[PDB]
Ligand binder design. Structure first.
Ligand SMILES: NC(=O)c1cccnc1
Ligand SMILES: NC(=O)c1cccnc1
Lengths: 133, 133
C-alpha cells in the first residue's frame, strides 16, 4: 500500500484538477506552511511561506483556481520515511487574460502522523518559467 | 554570480571527488544535520539524521570514503531563495569487496547566511537502488 506522503501529494493534485477547494484544504494540517516556491516570489510574497488554513485558502483562490493552474507529476522520489516525499512537477497556469506560463520544479512534501500536509516546498523561481500564446 | 546554496552544494561534491575530508567538513555549519536519506536507513540508522561536525566526519569516513562514493549532478533546481537548492544526483558506491550499487534521488540543501551547510536531505531508499558486478 501507498505511503501517507504519496497519498497526500497525489490527493493534493487530484483536488487541484477537480477544482475542489474544500477537498484540498482538508488535506492540510492546521499548521501547514506552503512555500511555493521557497523564497520571495509572486506566490510567496514575504518569502517565509503561506501559513495556516485560512491564508492557504486565499492562496488556492488566487494562485491555483483563478490562474487555471494545472499540475502534472513527471517523476516521484520516495524517501526512507513514509511521511516525506519529493516529486518533479510541471505547473501550467494563465495570466493577463489567457497568456500561459509553465515551470518545472522539485516539490517536497511532509505529512504528520495523521497524514495531513504540514509542508509543501517548491524549488523554482520566476527566471525558470517558460511562456506561451 | 552563483548563489551560496549552489556554491556549497557544488563544493560538497567537488570535495567528495577530491577525497577531501577536511574541505568537506569546512563546508558544514556547526549545527549541520545530514539526512542521507531522510528516514531510517543504513546511512541514517536512527532515522533522525547525523548531527554535528564530529558525527558527520564519521559519516564521511564510513559512507563516503570507505565505500568509494561518487556523486554526479544530473539536474539542478534553484529555488527563489539564494540559500536553498535541490538537485537530482546519482550516487555510486561499493560494498562487500567491490560489488556496486547506484541510486538516483532528489537532494535538498540549505545554507545559513554565512554560506555553511545546515541541512542536506536525500529522497531515496534502499528499494530504489540498482546493483552491479
Ligand atoms: N500538490 C499541490 O497541491 C500543488 C503543487 C504545486 C503547486 N500548487 C499546488
Ligand atoms: N553533496 C554531498 O556532499 C553528498 C551528496 C550525497 C551523498 N553524500 C554526499
Amino acid at each position: 500500500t501507498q505511503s501517507p506522503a504519496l497519498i497526500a501529494s497525489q490527493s493534493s493534485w487530484r483536488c487541484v484538477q477537480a477544482h475542489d477547494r474544500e477537498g484540498w484544504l482538508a488535506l492540510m494540517a492546521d499548521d501547514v506552511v506552503i512555500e511555493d516556491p521557497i523564497g520571495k516570489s509572486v506566490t510567496n510574497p514575504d518569502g517565509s511561506g503561506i501559513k495556516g488554513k485560512e491564508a492557504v485558502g486565499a492562496f488556492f483562490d488566487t494562485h491555483i483556481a483563478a490562474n487555471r493552474l494545472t499540475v502534472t507529476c513527471e517523476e516521484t522520489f520516495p524517501s526512507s520515511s513514509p511521511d516525506e516525499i519529493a516529486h518533479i512537477l510541471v505547473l501550467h497556469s494563465e495570466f493577463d487574460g489567457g497568456f500561459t506560463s509553465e515551470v518545472r520544479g522539485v516539490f517536497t512534501y511532509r505529512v504528520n502522523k495523521a497524514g495531513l500536509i504540514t509542508n509543501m516546498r517548491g524549488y523554482w523561481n520566476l527566471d525558470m518559467m517558460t511562456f506561451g500564446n
